[PDB]
Amino acid sequence: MIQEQTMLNVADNSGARRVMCIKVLGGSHRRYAGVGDIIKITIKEAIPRGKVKKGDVLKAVVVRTKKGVRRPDGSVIRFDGNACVLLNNNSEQPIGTRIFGPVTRELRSEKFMKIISLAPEV
Amino acid sequence: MKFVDEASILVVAGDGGNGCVSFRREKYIPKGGPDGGDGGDGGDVWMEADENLNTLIDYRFEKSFRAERGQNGASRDCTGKRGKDVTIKVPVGTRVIDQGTGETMGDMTKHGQRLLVAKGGWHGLGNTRFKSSVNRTPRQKTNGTPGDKRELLLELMLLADVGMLGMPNAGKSTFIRAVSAAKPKVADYPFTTLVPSLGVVRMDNEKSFVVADIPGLIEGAAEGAGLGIRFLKHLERCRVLLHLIDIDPIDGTDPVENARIIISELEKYSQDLATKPRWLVFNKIDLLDKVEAEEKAKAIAEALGWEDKYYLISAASGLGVKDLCWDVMTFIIENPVV
Amino acid sequence: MLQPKRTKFRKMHKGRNRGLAQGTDVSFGSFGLKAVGRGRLTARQIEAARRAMTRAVKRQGKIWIRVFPDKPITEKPLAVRMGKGKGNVEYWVALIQPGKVLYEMDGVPEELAREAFKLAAAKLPIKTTFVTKTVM
RNA sequence: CGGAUAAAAGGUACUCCGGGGAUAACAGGCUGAUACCGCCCAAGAGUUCAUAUCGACGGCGGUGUUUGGCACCUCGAUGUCGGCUCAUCACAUCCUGGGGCUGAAGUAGGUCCCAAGGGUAUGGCUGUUCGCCAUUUAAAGUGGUACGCGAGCUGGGUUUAGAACGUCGUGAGACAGUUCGGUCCCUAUCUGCCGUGGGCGCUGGAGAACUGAGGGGGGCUGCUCCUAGUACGAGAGGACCGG
RNA sequence: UCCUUGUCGGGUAAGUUCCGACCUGCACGAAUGGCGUAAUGAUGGCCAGGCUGUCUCCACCCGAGACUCAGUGAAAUUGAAC
RNA sequence: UCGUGAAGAGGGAAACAACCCAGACCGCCAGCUAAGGUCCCAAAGUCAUGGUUAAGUGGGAAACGAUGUGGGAAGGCCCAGACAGCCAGGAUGUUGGCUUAGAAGCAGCCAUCAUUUAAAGAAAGCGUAAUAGCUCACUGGUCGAGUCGGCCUGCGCGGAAGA
Ligand SMILES: Nc1nc2c(ncn2[C@@H]2O[C@H](COP(=O)(O)OP(=O)(O)O)[C@@H](O)[C@H]2O)c(=O)[nH]1
Ligand SMILES: [Mg+2]
């Protein structure tokens, strides 16, 4: 349930700490983002010694949603603090070497199982 | 995809959107401010490479390219939209030359490079920008800057990593009938192949090179002998040069002086091709005995002053074609472009 | 372009295009072009028609001109109401009445005359016709 | 210069009164000077080859949304620019759809023809229309609607009265100029539209089921996979259709 | 006075507003006062942090009208109207 | 300058005072007529004769283009066989000399050759570099009666897309 101009957390060791997504993708009049999506972000707070720098605009994938996901058996997986993983703009490969926090199993259907390979918790 | 042609085009960049003068008049009040805005920036021209295109056939068809002229200023302080930048799809490896002591603009080596050729004119100013107290009625406007005009000589020149030149009807096209996937027309008559049908060889993964075809020619400074400098232009980025010499031609003279003059005319082309490393290989060895064509093969080397390995290659028979490829590939890898 | 260098008056009344023809017959060459429609010819049209036919006829022969501007017209500038004197100087035109010759030709065969006059007839804003000189 | 005093210059956005569309501005219908669109005439440039593709000197037509002028007026009142809600119509079609040509190998392209069923963006700047930039998709269409919509909303621009700035005049003031703040009323009679009812008719009356003369509503598609890395293609690259 | 909002920096992913500066700038202008000025201001403009139905996108509920019944009972406007 | 309305009703132009006919003293349940019409709406010819139109032109438009069609003045050939078809000929000295790698009717120059049987050109077009082959003008045989494109003109077609 992530929309335009939404402040999210960062769930990788790329270097960003506080991030603000600016453009959700999927089609015309794309309202809100689910759990597995390509969303464009702008860096608002990052360590000066990190791999990235403040103000850079690039793509990212949400991993945790405050609203949650919808299991096909009437179940939801809510979270406390929406988070993203850094991905390159031209290529869809993620930047961070490690992933912090659990990632839901629903990301397999969205075809980003590499994130699921990381983040040993769940 | 059977002919290669080169020509020249005229590119014109749109001048900037001209300024406008106006005065707003409401339905009741007859006096209003100096309404009107700026113009639109002229459309530029971008020089973009393309994989799909391999010739300049459409450029003979269309010798003039027009950029979008910037929209004029309108009322209600309206500014015209910037003219759309016209992008021209060009095969990779093109060189462009101008007139009036003109020179090259930039060499294209990889796809995705976009080159700025024409700068469009820049928009003018409306009467509103001349707002002031003492004037209080600006009737002045600034004309848009004129667009940039030039004539481009489009020279197409192949990305031939491995370039080869040989005797007429010596099997240059037959040499492509080897592991090379290209299929040039092959026949016994001299100058069988006229269109450069470049090919590629993939021995193994992560390692491959491209080979181009250039027909032989007779000693002529001008355009005589049918073929000439117009085909030699496709050279000059060939990191290796291959020389093919026939052994015992069925009807031609045996190579004792004609194989030497072909070296001499390379010097006078433009710069002796920067004295690139040239490799000499032979052909027509299956016609005679294998051992008979050994002593006479080296005899030509010191006859022409050649001190290299003088490789013996059977293009049609297919023996030794792999041996030459192994040697050239190691030389290519150990000498990267720098 | 074609215009007299000196004029008796800087501007002349509009006038009318009523009446009949005077130069029905050609008296200088063998072939000529005669106007069938009614209208006006400007300096540009006369220059364009002569240039167009000139490229079709070789120097051999002779070419005559029977139309002169002889008539000035002015145009009113923008953002000017009715009045404030007469119009400003833009260009002049000529009066054409259907039935008189426009151009005269001689010296080359009829087939070239047909081609030459056909090319120059389209650029003229009026319908024309071809005639041949008769005795007397 | 048929000669109101022998004797007289200006402003009023601080104005008022009585009249006028007898007289300007915006819009509406004449109009095409200028400029946009189409066609014809075709010398020339075009590897041969004019209209495969341009095309100089000219001509004929069309909305006409810029720059203009003309008689007609609502001055006992015709409320603007822009934004929100709401949409409608024409196709000179932005995408999707069907094709022609191609200097169209396939993908990707370019031009033209038919086609209006549907869809046709989110934010910073400025009051903005427009435009620039950032980022998506199939695009972020062009015009009429008196450049639609205040008896629906908004008063940000324009904005009487207060104050300040620059220029002219001795001055009052004028000023197509800039800044601050500055009242937007109406209970729907009728036409219109959205829903729901009463009376009567359908030929004795009543309860049900419907046929259908006609009308309205929806008609958008991105990605991936199999075909298939197949056809094509030197390779790079990469199909149509169907599911 | 203009051109490429003047263009570089902050502020923003993107800033015709804001902030000290480059210059091709000198008119004002020194009691129709000039420069700086702490504090002060329901003063003009801009930005940031928390905050929220201001908004995507509105939904529900509590009350007074709007609706029906009973009683009393206007209005502006109106040449006539099928 | 003239007429109309102003200061004129009535009839026609679908509606309209300035366009046409025509200036209402009043009444009638009569006839004639001007402009305009005679298929119906709405009153009168579904009248007669000789033509044109295929477009709904009629029923809005220009420059131009075209085997739309009717009429007229002519010209070439024509039962000593007209044009177009079908069955065949297309050859020869001859790969025509330079630019020519390769061109030899088909990239660049024609003096344009003429003689063989004649009916056919050192030749207008494909497919390449010619080669080799498809062809054409032309003639021979069969079919057997109009054919060929210039001129003037009437009526038509495209040019002619808006809420
Ligand atoms: N026997 C034999 N014939 C060969 C060989 N190489 C080439 N040829 C023949 O040479 C002929 C002409 O070769 P070509 O493509 O014209 O070479 P080019 O003269 O350089 O253009 C071909 O038809 C081949 O059959 C070889 O190695 N052996
Ligand atoms: Mg060869």
GROMACS .gro file of C-alpha atoms and ligand atoms in nm, chain B residues 166-175 185-193 215-216 283-287 313-317, ligand 1:
model
   59
  288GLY     CA    1   4.401  -1.091  -5.149
  289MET     CA    2   4.459  -1.154  -5.516
  290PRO     CA    3   4.164  -1.145  -5.758
  291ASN     CA    4   3.979  -1.480  -5.786
  292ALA     CA    5   4.219  -1.622  -5.526
  293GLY     CA    6   3.938  -1.756  -5.308
  294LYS     CA    7   3.866  -1.462  -5.077
  295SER     CA    8   3.495  -1.546  -5.089
  296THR     CA    9   3.585  -1.916  -5.084
  297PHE     CA   10   3.778  -1.848  -4.763
  307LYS     CA   11   2.873  -1.550  -5.397
  308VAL     CA   12   3.161  -1.770  -5.515
  309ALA     CA   13   3.263  -1.825  -5.877
  310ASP     CA   14   3.582  -1.865  -6.077
  311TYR     CA   15   3.568  -1.534  -6.265
  312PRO     CA   16   3.784  -1.242  -6.146
  313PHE     CA   17   3.629  -1.000  -5.896
  314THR     CA   18   3.351  -1.244  -5.811
  315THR     CA   19   3.253  -1.051  -5.497
  337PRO     CA   20   3.792  -0.757  -5.357
  338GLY     CA   21   4.130  -0.737  -5.523
  405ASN     CA   22   4.591  -2.056  -5.120
  406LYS     CA   23   4.540  -2.307  -5.402
  407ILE     CA   24   4.749  -2.580  -5.238
  408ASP     CA   25   4.517  -2.878  -5.296
  409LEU     CA   26   4.560  -2.839  -5.673
  435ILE     CA   27   4.593  -2.235  -4.620
  436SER     CA   28   4.348  -2.441  -4.826
  437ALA     CA   29   4.026  -2.238  -4.829
  438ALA     CA   30   3.818  -2.473  -5.044
  439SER     CA   31   3.972  -2.796  -4.914
 1085LIG     N1   32   4.091  -2.622  -5.540
 1085LIG     C1   33   4.083  -2.504  -5.474
 1085LIG     N2   34   4.010  -2.404  -5.529
 1085LIG     C2   35   3.999  -2.284  -5.467
 1085LIG     C3   36   4.067  -2.265  -5.339
 1085LIG     N3   37   4.039  -2.139  -5.300
 1085LIG     C4   38   3.961  -2.083  -5.395
 1085LIG     N4   39   3.936  -2.169  -5.495
 1085LIG     C5   40   3.855  -2.142  -5.616
 1085LIG     O1   41   3.878  -2.010  -5.667
 1085LIG     C6   42   3.758  -1.965  -5.730
 1085LIG     C7   43   3.747  -1.813  -5.731
 1085LIG     O2   44   3.764  -1.755  -5.602
 1085LIG     P1   45   3.707  -1.607  -5.577
 1085LIG     O3   46   3.590  -1.611  -5.482
 1085LIG     O4   47   3.667  -1.543  -5.707
 1085LIG     O5   48   3.830  -1.527  -5.510
 1085LIG     P2   49   3.860  -1.375  -5.551
 1085LIG     O6   50   3.929  -1.371  -5.687
 1085LIG     O7   51   3.953  -1.314  -5.449
 1085LIG     O8   52   3.731  -1.297  -5.557
 1085LIG     C8   53   3.644  -2.031  -5.655
 1085LIG     O9   54   3.545  -2.076  -5.747
 1085LIG     C9   55   3.707  -2.149  -5.583
 1085LIG    O10   56   3.652  -2.272  -5.633
 1085LIG    C10   57   4.144  -2.379  -5.285
 1085LIG    O11   58   4.205  -2.370  -5.176
 1085LIG     N5   59   4.147  -2.492  -5.356
   0.00000   0.00000   0.00000
